[PDB]
Amino acid sequence: SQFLLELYSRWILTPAILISEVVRSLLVVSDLFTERNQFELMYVTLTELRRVHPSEDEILAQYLVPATCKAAAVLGMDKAVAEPVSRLLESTLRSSHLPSRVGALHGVLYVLECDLLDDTAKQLIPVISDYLLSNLKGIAHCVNIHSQQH
């Protein structure tokens, strides 16, 4: 797992076909990172991408919102880390891409899971609380129509 951190950073920092499938291989092995040295290198490569890679690449948009959010949970959810992580979850829930809606909601959990979260950033749980009320009243009667794993 140390040999795979060196390889996938030099490709990011490659064609647009290979941009999307490299962010997805790094989120799966994340079960097996065994050191606090190893989780710190993961969060650094993913934030230099978003400011450089275009925002309208919605295949690439839905693998990285699961990727950037599981780093900041093992890491401290601190004031220099909350303001980059909290802003990215609000926008992708407004996206029209319905499998991009689903990857961004797993990133809510790990932030909400264990760390005693910052007091100003937990006032942005009513950002994520408001999205849940709107899509149950439409999927109360009919569930066969809308989706299954959304």
Binding site: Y63, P66, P99, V102
Partner: protein
Amino acid sequence: TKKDRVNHCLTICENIVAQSVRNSPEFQKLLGIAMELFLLCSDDAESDVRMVADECLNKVIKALMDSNLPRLQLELYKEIKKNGAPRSLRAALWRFAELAHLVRPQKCRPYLVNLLPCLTRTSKRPEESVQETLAAAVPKIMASFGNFANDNEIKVLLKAFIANLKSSSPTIRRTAAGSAVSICQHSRRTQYFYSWLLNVLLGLLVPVEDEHSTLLILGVLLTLRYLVPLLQVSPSAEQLVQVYELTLHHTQHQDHNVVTGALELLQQLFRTPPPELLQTLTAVGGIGQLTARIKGDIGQSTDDDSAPLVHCVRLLSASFLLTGGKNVLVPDRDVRVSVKALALSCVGAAVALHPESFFSKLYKVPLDTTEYPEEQYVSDILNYIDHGDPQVRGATAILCGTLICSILSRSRFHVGDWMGTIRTLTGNTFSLADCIPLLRKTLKDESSVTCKLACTAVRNCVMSLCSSSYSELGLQLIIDVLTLRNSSYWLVRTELLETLAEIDFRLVSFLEAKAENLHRGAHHYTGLLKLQERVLNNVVIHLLGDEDPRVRHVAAASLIRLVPKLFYKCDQGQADPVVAVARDQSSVYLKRIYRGYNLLPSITDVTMENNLSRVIAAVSHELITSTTRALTFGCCEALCLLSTAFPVCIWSLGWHCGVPPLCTVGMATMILTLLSSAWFPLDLSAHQDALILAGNLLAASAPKSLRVWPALGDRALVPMVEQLFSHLLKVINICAHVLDDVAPLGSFYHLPSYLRLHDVLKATHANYKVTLDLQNSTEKFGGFLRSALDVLSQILELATLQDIGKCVEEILGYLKSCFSREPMMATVCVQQLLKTLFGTPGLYHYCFMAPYTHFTQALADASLRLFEPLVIKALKQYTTTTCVQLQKQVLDLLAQLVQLRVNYCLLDSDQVFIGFVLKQFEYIEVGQFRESEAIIPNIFFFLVLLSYEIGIPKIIQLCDGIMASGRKAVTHAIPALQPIVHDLFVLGKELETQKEVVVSMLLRLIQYHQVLEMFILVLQQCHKENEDKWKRLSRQIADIILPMLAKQQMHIDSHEALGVLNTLFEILAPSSLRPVDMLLRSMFVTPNTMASVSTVQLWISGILAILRVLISQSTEDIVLSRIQELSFSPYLISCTVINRLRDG
């Protein structure tokens, strides 16, 4: 006097046009003298003088193309013979090619003889600026002065230009090459002069092992890039194979200007090949039957056991772009990257012809296993995706497009079985799993020149995969082009939408339901992969809202190509996506009111009315809920191109939204509020498309509403028609005050909203009168004046005499000023006013059970006067015009003054107009007339209808000349009789003799299937007039056509052609078909040779149309008693007899 010289030239110009007196013996002398003086103003060398006084000479001509054309063109021929200065002779030569198609064919033959002494001197001139404009006039002059010369005059002219291939200037070499090839399109015999230029040039390169003066080697290869587009006694099949071996020696002859000359000649002979040359290369033996840096045995193009296109890919690779030892690039130092670019585009156009070349070994005899470890195949061509610049990674982007296009069409989508045969023959390991990820990568490339060439590779390649076994990988390339919709190069976005117009989105919706991992794809998405609503809302309607006028026009034509191909879910026809693909491939393989509107019951497809009502739902939504200037402006251009392919009157249930709630008025209430704003009409590029679309939506109410404006009969519909008829008389009121320089019911003075429309029609009219260019489709005043006389026509049909009786004064004044600019559709405004001033389903249904029962149901039936100033002006135009779109609308204006009985006083004393129609029959038989095709159906309707008042004895002698002494029949002779037969057989002793004459002429012409529609009219009157005469005439054409069907003289090449001949045997009398002696000797026949699909195709149409008679007209009992007497052996076409004909 340099500022004194400027004021002199400009005051002569205005005092000729403002004379308003022409054809006068005082006015003739004045125009000759000061016309040569306009060019001395240009001959004097100052850019303040040369620019100013050349735009002023164009003000004279265009205001005088109507009045004095024979006076203009006589002063102008004088200056070329003067052979003046190279600046003086040049700008006169622009003027003379644009007025070549304005001459009359009466005076044309004197103009041809005088130019060939004048056109050879300007070919001998070494001025590189004088030689350029002649390659932009010998296209235009000898296409209108083409047909008037014999075989003597045109052989002299082509020996001169080849002596202009012997010069060393690159500007003078390419102007003598486009002059030889523009004549042979128009010479006298278009096919005889193609074979004559190929004999002259190959003696300039007769045997190639000589010294050929390498400037003169480049002269012969540039005349051949212009003529191979035209090759598709004739140019022989052995004449064209001498062209092809000449170039492969010249891809090796070292230079950089001679290597690049024979590589543009090879890229174009595979794209548009001549069909004689095209069969000799795909063939296995190939050239062997016609005769009876590289370091290996390639095997030349004479060898058998391999096609020559297997040979021609081995040769262009090891010399230019590949080294025979290892997968390695060749350096750019050795071969230029302008020379490596044209060699990747020639390997791709041959795979579309012979796809077995790309899998071959590079050397036939292997090359020295001591030096090199392994030998390689031609797959290192596909390692030039990483090579540097655009147009090499982009021209190996296009080498993988047509390698996938042409294996699927070669072996019929059997990528399993066809790849097995090659691998044991040439042992390469190259599947199509290793080329689509090479094509997925160049779509994501950086440079915007690299992205234009990789998206034409998906125009060829995603209609063949998606219906093949590799259609897992075929759907992914639909997905990635959708990310290419927002790149900022305007040529990158318009070759996307052509590969999203050629998509069949009913076959694309079928693969989505079968996918389970492809819906996820990358990053494991949840939900459906909705291609169709994402490619129609977020590209095609979205690219209507682009800033460019180039990008907005191309997106409309795709919604003409998308609407038959949608498949929205759960129609009341096609249910599944399985049943959707099955109905577009069964129609293929199993079978006077104005132009706006319709009165039929209008039989229509129920499920094709559903796909056209979802594309007018999302299009009226980015026109009302839009926030930009650019969304409102280029989506009135996408609604005017639906209504000219999917008209509103035929498809009204798709266009219907609301109004009259039931034959519809769809969506026409929004668009009048666009026009009544003072913002939207101020630009003529899309105000002319909002007037052709508001007349299509008030005419579809005509089958319903008709029983102020008393004929409308629907008071919720009258303010929509009150507005446009108020809107179209104020736009012929601003076009009348512009064509005549006059200061500013229909009145735009007191409106400040339409004083803004007077400054916009005056910017587009100062560029026409100053810049002479006659043949432009898009002019934006000449395009705008075409739009507002088309829709003033369509409303008058709804009007009556009582509404127009206060306006017949009004609309006739404007057209006298609106006559000269566009008279073609200013009589279409006059043709209509006189009408209304004188009153006038589940995949068993579709594949079998619905087409099986149209078969058996047609067999049981087989067992069965303010116009007087305006009318006189339109007759002076027909004698002096030359455009034959205007000559067709003037023969319909005179067939309406004789039906509506206007007395024959248009020619009060003489017979001036009727004498001129007889002379035009002299120019068609000989062929000295340019566009006789679009006038010969309407010349003959005017003549027969006057004789009820030239008599029908004289009318039928003119038609006999065209047929036997003149051109072919399907343009001239067969449309000549459609006016006569319908007006003689349908509508005492003098009338009996003339019916015997017309039936004898068609027997000489039975061979054509348009002549068999005229003869279904003849048999239906004899069953009504006299049934004794009905049976005599069906026996005479019984023993003519059945001797033709055995010798295959009957042109049944079309499916328009088999439909006409089967309604003939129903209506032919059954007494003439009752002996089965005749129908069987015409049936059981063998053709001459079945080698060619011109001859295989007419023998199997004689067997399908005499077999519709042995099933209905005679039962089973009668047929088989006869063949016991007639020894018709069953070895007639047997497997021994069919084998010797395809070869023979």
